[PDB]
Design a protein around this nucleic acid. Structure first.
Ligand SMILES: [Mg+2]
Ligand SMILES: [Mg+2]
Ligand SMILES: [Mg+2]
Ligand SMILES: [Mg+2]
Ligand SMILES: [Mg+2]
Ligand SMILES: [Mg+2]
Ligand SMILES: [Mg+2]
Ligand SMILES: [Mg+2]
Ligand SMILES: [Mg+2]
Ligand SMILES: [Mg+2]
Ligand SMILES: [Mg+2]
Ligand SMILES: [Mg+2]
Ligand SMILES: [Mg+2]
Ligand SMILES: [Mg+2]
Ligand SMILES: [Mg+2]
Ligand SMILES: [Mg+2]
Ligand SMILES: [Mg+2]
Ligand SMILES: [Mg+2]
Ligand SMILES: [Mg+2]
Ligand SMILES: [Mg+2]
Ligand SMILES: [Mg+2]
Ligand SMILES: [Mg+2]
Ligand SMILES: [Mg+2]
Ligand SMILES: [Mg+2]
Ligand SMILES: [Mg+2]
Ligand SMILES: [Mg+2]
Ligand SMILES: [Mg+2]
Ligand SMILES: [Mg+2]
Ligand SMILES: [Mg+2]
Ligand SMILES: [Mg+2]
Lengths: 96, 98, 151, 206, 127, 106
RNA sequence: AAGAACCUUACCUGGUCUUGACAUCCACGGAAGUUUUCAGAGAUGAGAAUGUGCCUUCGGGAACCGUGAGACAGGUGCUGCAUGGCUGUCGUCAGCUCGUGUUGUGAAAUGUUGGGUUAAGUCCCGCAACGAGCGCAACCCUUAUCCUUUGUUGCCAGCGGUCCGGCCGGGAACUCAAAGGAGACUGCCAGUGAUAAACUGGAGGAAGGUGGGGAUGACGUCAAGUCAUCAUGGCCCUUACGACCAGGGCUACACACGUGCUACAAUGGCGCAUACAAAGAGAAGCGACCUCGCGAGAGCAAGCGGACCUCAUAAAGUGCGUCGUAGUCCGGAUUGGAGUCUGCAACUCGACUCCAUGAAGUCGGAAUCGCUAGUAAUCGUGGAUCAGAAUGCCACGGUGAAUAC
């Protein structure tokens, strides 16, 4: 799916792990009720691509943005293909 | 005292594992409260089957997780150890903790 | 109904007076699945009617029905190539079913304060056969006998 | 497209699963991706070894991988020269210690995957599609296999209009869940485009 | 001694106990009127005991859970009839004739894909 | 039915097996042990068994038939005019043929 | 499209790159990596310190990073009238075919038609047909009754006293949980029927005539849909139709249609008190309790990978009181002010909270839709997607009809 689009996704994940989850304290430790200065808020010149809420969560095989399932990491139609051939343990057509 | 609960995706395999766990504990120990079924978890999924439009055409799947509980009330020591190195598991998850 | 003649679904009797007929009446009046609300409305109207006309609950109720029960109705049986309105006899069960439906329709159309008051007034008039429900029966009977030529 | 997948509908009745591990939601997606990575590498590498199916299971933070093949000697190679190389790469891809097993397939012409890819290879070699289908059905019935059935599709013989041209023999009770059907598919890449191949093989009733 | 019956009605399950004592009725540590004996379904609980007249001749201790007012009351009725028979099989005949012996298997129907609920289908238009 | 699996499984299919067995026995009985084509055919009525006569002619099998006044000869290699509806007449025909054929190669 | 602020995102305006954002190969140079500054909307350039981790008959080697040339890479660009795969539809309708035989010069026919019967090409009888296959039915899941087993985190009939809480000794009964079995088969009776198939009724039974629901979609039709999920023939671009960045747009608005939600009220609105569910989710998560705030929420902080803890108080209902038929104590749109939270960032363009404001609307022309029973109608609850963003979608239970001559 437009290999460049998948390239963006991998770069976004790498940047997010590099910068945030360690500089996430920047918006947590300081942006609270200390007693303040705004210097911390203005210290958001980070790449802006490190924000975890900026990744699209694409399908692992095809890479389409829509119809995604978190449990399997695949889009709806790749899930159905794998389910019919086996692959996904314990998954079978449901009736009740 | 020491509890064993097993998780698997099919009952035919979970029951075999419990029978093995119970019998070995009896052989190397005593008592055993016996396997306890505990409720089964049914996770459902619903997905469109057409690559394009056709919203009303979709399949429904489920994953059924089976659970069991053993509980040996008083390890005879010769028990606990043997409870180890007795995996013979190929799809059944065993957590050894109390 | 094309292939399969079917049976019948039984209904419980009224909890107060224990009559199937009154149980059906509350069902017809029941709106939206709120049976308890319908039961309250019916009982309030009946006790009011009994006070108005003496008698008793069930017997006073029956008197109202007997004045609105139809006996004959028209039914299109365009068989010859043109539509005719052949009068036809009404089954005993369909009689009171139509009567109860007409009474409820008239009461809802009546502009009083409470539904219980509306119902009490409507079937109290039907006891003397001056109400709107009685009027509809007259129209049905009158239309049928006009088309008496067909049978 | 109006028929259910014959393999998928029988997963809990007669047919087994191709993957037999347990996982929680945390690692369920990762295991699926790992299984996909190993299968695609392994199937690509063993293209000429006539691989029927790859079965993966993950006991105690390991990976086993069983290969059903009709030419095990080639898969194994001299002593263990080739199998060990496969194990090293599989372990690398999975990130965990990897075992490896080889199961030979008696009667290769009773396995739909081997039948389907045999037809596919012939089509890419410019063999008459009708002859390829006739041969597959004939020799499948010759060894039991009460219900062979085959089907092709798309630009048959280089035609400008696509065509299906299926062909069966015996009985193939697709509506009987109890029946043991061995359906599979394959795909050819002729010079005029793509040709799809489907095979159903029916066996004992249970 | 005690006699038992289970009873079940559309997601409700009861547990009734019969003693040959007074005519008191207790449901979940509450009186029949305290629980639902004056609101809807007041008399279904008594229905079975009306027939086989034993209203005051027997004491009832009951526990029920699941469902709603009508479902629970129906479960109580089914439990009582199953218990009475355990205290005098001779009654079956007329209990079955009354229709209380049969367990009403009328669960709610699941909703389907493409429908709004069970059978209600979305509005359709040609042109 | 005798030494096989007949008591096995449910009664109904066993009853079905008997019903079809007696159907097969009735439709094609005595012919079962023949194991081949005939080389002669004796027919009671030419018109009532014209299907059989036609098949015999196609295969080139000799046909001996008892033909009545309403029957159609020229499909029969050996025609025997006579009644074909009387019990006494047919009994005489079959008895004579059985007597004549009972002397095989001796 | 199971969820467009940025991203997604392709589209537009600008600012940029050219073996390239993504991959293999060659040579050269350097570990990788880390902390900071300037310019810039940013992409990107200019710098400075830091670190320098494994090999070596060294034109040198392993992961990694930059430079140069090429083969190449790249394309959500066109063709679903070149295709695979997948899907809708007639239609879960009962049909569609073949081998051999026979009939006809032949296209073809027979079988598959006829008498009954069935939900059914379902079954019986007859018959130049004799058999077979795909379809129907059954085998599968779930629900309705019972039995054995097991008994915690689930349960409490009989026993002890209890803080009156199954809470704690205890009990394995019961509900329940989930494995294994039984049960329903026109099987039994009567009548009808060619004595056949079958049909009507009755007994018993939790269940009676394929008990209810689901999955299951024959040969084919519509050159039906999808080249944008993916794959793929052909065609086309290659300092650009490829790649990167900021901002905007996909949310416009004289209009027309489809699908929904909320109403027009007294079978109701509002205030107080109170009863009864099922099914699910949870670790970058669900988040008790307590304190603060009118509120959305905030602070502190248990427990829980969970029959244990949390989400999480079900609402209709039922008792009291009030409103008294009004554009109203109906209805809530719209707008002003003040705020909370998510997120780098709520102007275009988020959700929710408080105060104020209080449109249309009084049951809807021609026309038209769904539904046969736990159904319609109505009342709540949960989940996927997901930082945040459901009146949509997918599921769960409560109350519960009318009518089929
Ligand atoms: Mg691509
Ligand atoms: Mg997002
Ligand atoms: Mg759970
Ligand atoms: Mg389908
Ligand atoms: Mg942008
Ligand atoms: Mg955008
Ligand atoms: Mg530009
Ligand atoms: Mg098409
Ligand atoms: Mg001919
Ligand atoms: Mg036909
Ligand atoms: Mg024909
Ligand atoms: Mg017929
Ligand atoms: Mg058939
Ligand atoms: Mg026939
Ligand atoms: Mg006590
Ligand atoms: Mg019966
Ligand atoms: Mg079927
Ligand atoms: Mg087209
Ligand atoms: Mg279409
Ligand atoms: Mg198109
Ligand atoms: Mg396009
Ligand atoms: Mg849009
Ligand atoms: Mg959620
Ligand atoms: Mg208001
Ligand atoms: Mg107005
Ligand atoms: Mg008004
Ligand atoms: Mg219907
Ligand atoms: Mg709702
Ligand atoms: Mg959400
Ligand atoms: Mg519902």
């Amino acid at each position: 799916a437009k290999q460049s689009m998948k390239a963006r996704e991998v770069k976004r994940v790498a940047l997010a792990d590099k910068y945030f989850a360690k500089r996430a304290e920047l918006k947590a430790i300081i942006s609270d009720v200390n007693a303040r200065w705004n210097a911390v808020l203005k210290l958001q010149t980070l790449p802006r691509d490190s924000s975890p809420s900026r990744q699209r969560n694409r399908c692992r095989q095809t890479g389409r943005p829509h119809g995604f399932l978190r449990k399997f990491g695949l889009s709806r139609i790749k899930v159905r293909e794998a389910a019919m051939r086996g692959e996904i343990p314990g998954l079978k057509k449901a009736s009740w | 005292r020491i509890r064993i609960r097993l998780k698997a995706f099919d009952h035919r395999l979970i029951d075999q594992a419990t029978a093995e766990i119970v019998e070995t504990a009896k052989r190397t120990g005593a008592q055993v409260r016996g396997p306890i079924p505990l409720p089964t978890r049914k996770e459902r999924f619903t997905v469109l089957i057409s690559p394009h439009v056709n919203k009303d055409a979709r399949d429904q799947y489920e994953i059924r997780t089976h659970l069991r509980l053993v509980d040996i009330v008083e390890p005879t020591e010769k028990t606990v150890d043997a409870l180890m190195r007795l995996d013979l598991a190929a799809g059944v998850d065993v957590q050894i903790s109390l | 109904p094309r292939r399969r003649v079917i049976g019948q679904r039984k209904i419980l009797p009224d909890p107060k007076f224990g009559s199937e007929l009154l149980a059906k009446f509350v069902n017809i009046l029941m709106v939206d699945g709120k049976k308890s609300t319908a039961e309250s409305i019916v009982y309030s109207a009946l006790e009011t009617l009994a006070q108005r006309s003496g008698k008793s609950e069930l017997e006073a109720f029956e008197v109202a029905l007997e004045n609105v029960r139809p006996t004959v109705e028209v039914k299109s049986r365009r068989v010859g190539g043109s539509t005719y309105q052949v009068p036809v006899e009404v089954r005993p069960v369909r009689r009171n079913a139509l009567a109860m439906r007409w009474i409820v329709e008239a009461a809802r159309k009546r502009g009083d304060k409470s539904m219980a008051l509306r119902l009490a007034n409507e079937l109290s008039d039907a006891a003397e056969n001056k109400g709107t429900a009685v009027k509809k029966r007259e129209d049905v009977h009158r239309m049928a006998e006009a088309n008496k030529a067909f049978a | 497209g109006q028929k259910v997948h014959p393999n998928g509908i029988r997963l809990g009745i007669v047919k087994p699963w191709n993957s037999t591990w347990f996982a929680n939601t945390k690692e369920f997606a990762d295991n699926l991706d790992s299984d996909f990575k190993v299968r695609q590498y392994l199937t690509k590498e063993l293209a000429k070894a006539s691989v029927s199916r790859i079965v993966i299971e993950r006991p105690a933070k390991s990976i086993r991988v069983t290969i059903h093949t009709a030419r095990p000697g080639i898969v194994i190679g001299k002593k263990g020269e080739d199998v060990e190389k496969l194990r090293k790469v599989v372990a690398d891809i999975a990130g965990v210690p990897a075992q490896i097993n080889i199961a030979e397939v008696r009667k290769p012409e009773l396995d739909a995957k081997l039948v389907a890819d045999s037809i596919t290879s012939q089509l890419e070699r410019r063999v008459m599609f009708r002859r390829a289908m006739k041969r597959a059905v004939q020799n499948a019935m010759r060894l039991g296999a009460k219900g062979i059935k085959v089907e092709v599709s798309g630009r048959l013989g280089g035609a400008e209009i696509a065509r299906t041209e299926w062909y069966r023999e015996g009985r193939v009770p697709l509506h009987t869940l109890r029946a043991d059907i061995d359906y599979n598919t394959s795909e050819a890449h002729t010079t005029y485009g793509v040709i799809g191949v489907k095979v159903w093989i029916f066996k004992g009733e249970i | 001694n005690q006699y038992y019956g289970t009873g079940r009605r559309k997601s409700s399950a009861a547990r009734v106990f019969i003693k040959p004592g007074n005519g008191k009725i207790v449901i979940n540590q509450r009186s029949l009127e305290q629980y639902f004996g004056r609101e809807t379904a007041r008399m279904v609980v008594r229905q079975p005991l009306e027939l086989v007249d034993m209203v005051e001749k027997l004491d009832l201790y009951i526990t029920v859970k699941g469902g709603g007012i009508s479902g629970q009351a129906g479960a109580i009725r089914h439990g009582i009839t199953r218990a009475l028979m355990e205290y005098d099989e001779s009654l079956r005949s007329e209990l079955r004739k009354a229709g209380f012996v049969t367990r009403d298997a009328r669960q709610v129907e699941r909703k389907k894909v493409g429908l709004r609920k069970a059978r209600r289908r979305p509005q359709f238009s040609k042109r | 039915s005798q030494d096989g699996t007949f008591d096995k499984l449910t009664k109904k299919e066993a009853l079905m097996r008997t019903r079809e067995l007696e159907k097969l026995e009735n439709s094609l009985g005595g012919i079962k042990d023949m194991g081949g084509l005939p080389d002669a055919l004796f027919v009671i009525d030419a018109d009532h068994e014209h299907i059989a006569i036609k098949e015999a002619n196609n295969l080139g099998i000799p046909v001996f038939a008892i033909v009545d006044t309403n029957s159609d000869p020229d499909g029969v290699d050996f025609v025997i005019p006579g009644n074909d509806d009387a019990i006494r007449a047919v009994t005489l025909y079959l008895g004579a043929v059985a007597a004549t054929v009972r002397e095989g190669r001796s």
